[PDB]
Amino acid sequence: SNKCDVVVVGGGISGMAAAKLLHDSGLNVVVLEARDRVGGRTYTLRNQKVKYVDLGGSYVGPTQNRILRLAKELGLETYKVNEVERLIHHVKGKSYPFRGPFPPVWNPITYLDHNNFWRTMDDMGREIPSDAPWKAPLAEEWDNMTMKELLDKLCWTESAKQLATLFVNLCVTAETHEVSALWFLWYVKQCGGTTRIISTTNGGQERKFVGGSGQVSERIMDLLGDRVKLERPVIYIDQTRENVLVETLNHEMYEAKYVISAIPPTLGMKIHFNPPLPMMRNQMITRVPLGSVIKCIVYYKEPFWRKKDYCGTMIIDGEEAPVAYTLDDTKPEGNYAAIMGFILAHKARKLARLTKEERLKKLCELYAKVLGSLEALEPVHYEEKNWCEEQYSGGCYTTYFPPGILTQYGRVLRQPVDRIYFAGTETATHWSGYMEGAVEAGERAAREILHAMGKIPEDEIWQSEPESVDVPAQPITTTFLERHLPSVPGLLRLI
Amino acid sequence: SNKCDVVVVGGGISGMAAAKLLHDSGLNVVVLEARDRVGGRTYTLRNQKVKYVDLGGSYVGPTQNRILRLAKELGLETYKVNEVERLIHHVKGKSYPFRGPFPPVWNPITYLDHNNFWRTMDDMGREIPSDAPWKAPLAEEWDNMTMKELLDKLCWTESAKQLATLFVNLCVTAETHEVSALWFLWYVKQCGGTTRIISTTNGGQERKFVGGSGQVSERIMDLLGDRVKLERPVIYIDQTRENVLVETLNHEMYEAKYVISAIPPTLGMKIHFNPPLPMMRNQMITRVPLGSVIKCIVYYKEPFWRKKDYCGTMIIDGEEAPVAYTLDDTKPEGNYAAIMGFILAHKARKLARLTKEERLKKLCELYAKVLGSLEALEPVHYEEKNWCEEQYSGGCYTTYFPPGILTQYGRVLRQPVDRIYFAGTETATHWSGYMEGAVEAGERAAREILHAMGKIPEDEIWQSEPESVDVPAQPITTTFLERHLPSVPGLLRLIGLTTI
Numbered sequence: 001s002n003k004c005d006v007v008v009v010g011g012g013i014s015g016m017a018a019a020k021l022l023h024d025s026g027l028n029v030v031v032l033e034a035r036d037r038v039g040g041r042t043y044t045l046r047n048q049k050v051k052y053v054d055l056g057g058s059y060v061g062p063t064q065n066r067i068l069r070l071a072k073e074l075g076l077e078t079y080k081v082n083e084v085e086r087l088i089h090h091v092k093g094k095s096y097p098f099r100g101p102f103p104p105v106w107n108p109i110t111y112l113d114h115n116n117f118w119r120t121m122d123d124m125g126r127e128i129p130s131d132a133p134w135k136a137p138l139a140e141e142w143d144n145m146t147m148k149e150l151l152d153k154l155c156w157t158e159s160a161k162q163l164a165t166l167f168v169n170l171c172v173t174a175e176t177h178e179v180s181a182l183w184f185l186w187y188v189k190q191c192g193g194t195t196r197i198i199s200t201t202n203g204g205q206e207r208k209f210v211g212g213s214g215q216v217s218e219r220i221m222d223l224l225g226d227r228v229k230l231e232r233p234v235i236y237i238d239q240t241r242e243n244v245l246v247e248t249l250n251h252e253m254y255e256a257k258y259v260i261s262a263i264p265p266t267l268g269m270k271i272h273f274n275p276p277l278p279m280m281r282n283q284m285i286t287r288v289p290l291g292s293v294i295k296c297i298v299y300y301k302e303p304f305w306r307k308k309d310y311c312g313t314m315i316i317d318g319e320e321a322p323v324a325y326t327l328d329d330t331k332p333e334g335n336y337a338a339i340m341g342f343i344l345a346h347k348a349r350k351l352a353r354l355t356k357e358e359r360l361k362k363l364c365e366l367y368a369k370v371l372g373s374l375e376a377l378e379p380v381h382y383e384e385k386n387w388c389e390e391q392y393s394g395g396c397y398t399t400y401f402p403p404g405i406l407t408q409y410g411r412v413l414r415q416p417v418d419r420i421y422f423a424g425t426e427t428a429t430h431w432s433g434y435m436e437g438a439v440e441a442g443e444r445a446a447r448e449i450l451h452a453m454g455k456i457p458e459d460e461i462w463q464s465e466p467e468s469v470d471v472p473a474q475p476i477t478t479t480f481l482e483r484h485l486p487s488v489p490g491l492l493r494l495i
Numbered sequence: 496s497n498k499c500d501v502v503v504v505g506g507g508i509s510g511m512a513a514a515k516l517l518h519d520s521g522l523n524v525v526v527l528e529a530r531d532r533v534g535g536r537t538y539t540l541r542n543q544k545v546k547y548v549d550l551g552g553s554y555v556g557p558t559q560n561r562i563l564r565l566a567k568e569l570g571l572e573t574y575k576v577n578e579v580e581r582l583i584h585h586v587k588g589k590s591y592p593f594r595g596p597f598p599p600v601w602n603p604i605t606y607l608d609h610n611n612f613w614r615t616m617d618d619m620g621r622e623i624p625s626d627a628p629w630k631a632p633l634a635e636e637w638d639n640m641t642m643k644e645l646l647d648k649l650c651w652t653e654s655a656k657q658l659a660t661l662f663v664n665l666c667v668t669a670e671t672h673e674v675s676a677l678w679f680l681w682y683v684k685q686c687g688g689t690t691r692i693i694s695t696t697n698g699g700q701e702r703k704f705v706g707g708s709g710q711v712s713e714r715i716m717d718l719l720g721d722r723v724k725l726e727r728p729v730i731y732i733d734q735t736r737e738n739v740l741v742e743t744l745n746h747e748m749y750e751a752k753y754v755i756s757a758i759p760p761t762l763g764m765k766i767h768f769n770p771p772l773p774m775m776r777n778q779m780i781t782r783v784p785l786g787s788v789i790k791c792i793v794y795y796k797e798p799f800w801r802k803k804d805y806c807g808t809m810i811i812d813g814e815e816a817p818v819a820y821t822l823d824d825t826k827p828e829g830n831y832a833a834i835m836g837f838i839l840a841h842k843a844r845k846l847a848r849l850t851k852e853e854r855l856k857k858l859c860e861l862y863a864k865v866l867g868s869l870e871a872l873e874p875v876h877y878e879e880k881n882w883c884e885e886q887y888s889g890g891c892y893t894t895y896f897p898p899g900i901l902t903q904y905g906r907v908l909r910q911p912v913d914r915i916y917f918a919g920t921e922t923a924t925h926w927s928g929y930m931e932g933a934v935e936a937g938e939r940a941a942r943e944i945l946h947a948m949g950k951i952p953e954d955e956i957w958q959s960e961p962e963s964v965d966v967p968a969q970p971i972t973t974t975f976l977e978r979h980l981p982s983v984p985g986l987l988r989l990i991g992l993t994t995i
């Protein structure tokens with residue numbers, strides 16, 4: 001067998017970040033990666049037609065200081081996603097251009113309803129601890145409802161309910177009826193709230209990495225050299241003896257003092273454990289699916305939308321549209337003009353039956369309607385990735401919690417099992433679901449092991465991160481009216 | 496490689512029934528079983544204090560003709576669970592004895608609400624095809640709500656909502672907010688409806704096997720000889736070549752024409768697939784958890800409850816009660832007096848933290864109160880099994896579907912993947928979740944392979960079963976008033992219209 005200090009299962013950002021921290025501390029680490037590549041739910045494709053394109057995770061933004069710091073250390077730079085010109089909200093077959101993060105609403109009743117919806121999501125989030133959402137005062141009540149039930153109670157207008165539904169679908173690649181209200185409200189709150197999570201400028205979608213996000217994992221693999229073993233799916237972990245034994249599908253055996261599991265929680269099912277996992281983890285890893293998304297990038301000769309004072313952001317309501325949300329994917333130089341779109345949740349399942357060429361046609365025709373331009377019908381290239389088909393991801397962007405699961409099983413997610421510690425973005429407390437969360441969790445799991453070895457004190461397990469000098473955060477603000485305008489039933493109680 | 500016609504993954508009733516059918520038809524079969532035993536979600540413990548006891552699946556009843564025929568062919572016999580004396584409904588800290596399958600309800604408004612609840616569950620069920628629940632006219636609407644939401648709409652009394660909640664918890668070992676309304680409605684309908692599923696006499700809980708249900712799987716293993724390989728967990732299936740390659744954890748390779756996967760759907764995750772599974776199955780197997788239950792058997796010197804004219808059945812509502820349902824588990828000879836109880840859904844998670852001795856004490860104290868009997872505090876022995884801890888089951892009794900999953904992913908549950916066919920009780924269309932469904936699915940999977948091999952025509956894949964001569968099925972009947980009495984909102988409409 002191959003002996004080392006720590007085996008890290010999974011060579012995504014989380015596993016790589018954990019392995020780098022342990023390596024830098026002087027431990028001998030091995031990373032066992034199932035695929036013939038690193039990066040996991042990140043994947044940057046290079047060819048002459050696109051130069052490079054993120055087909056998985058791409059965006060980073062203010063308050064995501066760990067990913068920004070790690071990438072900077074590895075020699076990467078960011079550029080801003082184009083938001084110079086107007087955004088579009090396409091509603092009932094018409095495009096309404098706008099500025100600022102939220103589409104305007106003109107009907108006074110609809111206005112009150114929309115304002116109340118966003119405000120209430122943040123009000124509720126303030127009572128949910130980031131590190132322990134199951135300790136929310138109404139944890140059980142909120143966990144036993146779906147997001148669909150919550151939106152049905154909160155939204156007096158169909159307009160607000162359709163936009164709220166789109167929000168859930170885009171944020172967590174799942175249907176409102178599939179997900180726990182508690183979990184979803186935690187998810188938003190732990191990215192800094194509604195404004196921060198939905199915003200391009202000053203939010204989660206502000207920036208991309210020059211040359212692609214895949215470079216984070218690739219460049220850590222570059223540092224680690226042959227410590228990274230590709231095409232080594234872990235099948236078996238045995239903790240009955242002095243050292244932990246980790247076996248791969250290609251018949252290799254690794255021996256270590258500790259293990260970090262840096263895979264999505266449910267993919268723990270692909271590993272046979274000796275002794276068996278404790279009851280609560282055994283059942284938890286069957287209760288935590290990942291969402292469904294096809295990421296699609298359509299290329300054009302020029303970023304023609306800019307000529308009509310549109311930035312390329314489209315927010316597209318309704319069942320018929322294949323794609324509910326787009327961003328401009330053009331490179332910083334104004335070349336490789338492109339629109340990135342997501343085919344979300346049930347639509348990913350529905351439209352996966354089509355051919356690549358059939359999806360291209362539907363997207364181009366949609367974009368022609370929304371951008372009001374025949375130029376959208378003349379694509380020069382197309383790339384896509386359906387994450388639902390990946391054996392070693394399970395989906396994208398991340399794991400969702402159905403009703404009842406987070407309160408009953410959430411405490412087990414990052415609880416060590418003897419000498420196995422748990423990384424992965426699902427275990428983060430700030431931007432869980434994102435590349436930022438992957439870094440937080442990997443570095444925390446690594447430091448749990450450093451503490452178990454006696455190398456650092458307990459109070460160094462969780463570590464704050466200085467703010468990025470390159471991507472500083474501006475405060476999230478609200479207006480007096482936003483804070484104090486009544487809800488729809490509030491206006492009725494006054495009548 | 497060890498060569499054969501068909502590799503069956505899993506030695507539970509479904510895999511063993513499939514293997515038997517294939518073997519009897521002249522094929523060479525191998526059964527690869529992860530555990531050191533066959534039976535899976537069935538397990539019959541034997542020791543001198545209990546003689547034998549079913550710690551997993553136990554009950555069979557009228558309309559479950561496949562398991563009865565299989566068991567009979569293997570030389571097994573049934574006996575009737577004791578329902579001679581009165582049942583007990585324990586609610587708000589008091590016990591109310593009764594006869595008939597449902598506790599009687601006296602308050603007229605509450606009676607209308609209860610009657611409408613059960614009626615409506617069956618009414619909705621009739622809209623749902625047993626073999627394609629996603630084809631129900633309102634499949635989407637019903638699949639996008641939980642059972643909690645449906646009970647909140649349907650039940651105009653707390654009395655009905657509480658009993659309905661216990662019904663869901665007991666039937667599918669899951670909370671009302673955890674499960675899809677469409678899936679639960681399908682599940683009940685495919686067992687023959689509310690009366691059949693809840694009943695002891697004339698229903699699902701009527702009988703047990705003399706000597707334990709584990710004998711079904713054991714006796715098939717005896718017939719198959721060394722074709723059953725114990726402690727062979729499957730880790731890898733490769734369909735890239737002419738013959739299917741199946742690899743086990745202990746480093747053996749098996750080569751076959753076809754494979755039957757006879758394991759719970761989510762446990763497919765423990766196998767690495769080459770090529771990868773198609774998208775819909777890849778995601779489906781991450782979306783289908785099993786329920787949570789501890790099965791607990793408390794032994795006594797005598798079946799003392801019978802002397803108070805109680806049969807041993809207790810239907811126990813309330814958060815403080817660890818166990819919501821009991822049955823008399825005394826042997827047919829009248830010795831090894833015992834009460835079987837289930838600790839359900841969240842309570843299985845909550846009470847797992849205690850010791851065995853602490854759980855025994857809580858159960859005895861509950862039974863003493865419910866039975867009004869100090870004798871319940873004098874147990875002579877205890878056995879239990881927490882199915883939540885089983886790596887190779889995932890839970891019990893069966894797989895549940897959360898909201899939204901059955902309409903999006905249900906169609907791939909028994910869809911073949913190249914040369915892999917799918918058995919397991921989860922893929923049945925009649926008593927899915929039960930030993931019966933395991934037999935149906937195993938035999939159906941085997942015959943899919945026989946059809947693929949050109950050995951039988953397509954119309955023999957699905958095969959009806961003759962009614963048991965030993966366990967005749969009384970029909971499910973209603974009264975005129977049961978059919979036509981209004982719901983609570985229907986009564987309110989009638990009142991509004993009169994007064995107009």
Ligand SMILES: *Cc1cc2c(cc1C)nc1c(=O)[nH]c(=O)nc-1n2C[C@H](O)[C@H](O)[C@H](O)COP(=O)(O)OP(=O)(O)OC[C@H]1O[C@@H](n2cnc3c(N)ncnc32)[C@H](O)[C@@H]1O
Nearest residue numbers: 010012013014034040041057058059234396425433434435
């Ligand atoms: C898919 C996706 C993700 C995504 C998104 C859009 C799409 C289409 N957009 C994002 C965005 O704009 N900004 C952002 O910050 N995140 C975005 N996401 C999510 C993001 O990609 C993820 O949060 C992050 O990449 C997750 O990182 P983590 O390291 O936690 O997880 P992973 O990437 O899945 O890596 C796990 C690795 O483990 C390997 N594996 C799996 N099973 C095994 C076994 N048995 N043995 C050995 N290795 C295993 C995987 O192959 C993978 O490499």
Ligand SMILES: *Cc1cc2c(cc1C)nc1c(=O)[nH]c(=O)nc-1n2C[C@H](O)[C@H](O)[C@H](O)COP(=O)(O)OP(=O)(O)OC[C@H]1O[C@@H](n2cnc3c(N)ncnc32)[C@H](O)[C@@H]1O
Nearest residue numbers: 505507508509529535536552553554729891920928929930
């Ligand atoms: C657990 C339980 C079940 C149960 C019940 C009460 C409890 C506590 N009460 C029942 C009842 O009264 N009447 C009834 O008809 N059913 C009842 N249930 C359900 C019943 O036990 C199940 O429906 C039935 O036994 C399921 O049979 P099936 O053959 O479909 O599935 P299984 O028993 O789980 O068998 C699967 C076998 O596969 C093995 N396995 C798992 N993974 C692997 C891998 N990777 N490789 C090889 N083998 C694998 C398992 O070990 C098992 O033996």
Ligand SMILES: Cc1ccc(NC(=O)c2coc3ccccc3c2=O)cc1C
Nearest residue numbers: 101102103167170171197198199205315
């Ligand atoms: C009006 C509006 C604008 C942007 C958004 N965006 C989001 O919520 C996003 C949430 O998480 C993401 C994760 C990966 C990539 C993109 C996103 C979002 O844009 C939502 C609404 C309702």
Ligand SMILES: Cc1ccc(NC(=O)c2coc3ccccc3c2=O)cc1C
Nearest residue numbers: 596597598662665666692693694700810
């Ligand atoms: C009044 C009453 C009596 C029995 C039941 N029982 C049930 O629903 C059961 C359904 O599934 C089972 C599965 C395995 C073992 C036992 C059972 C039940 O008793 C329910 C009610 C509401």
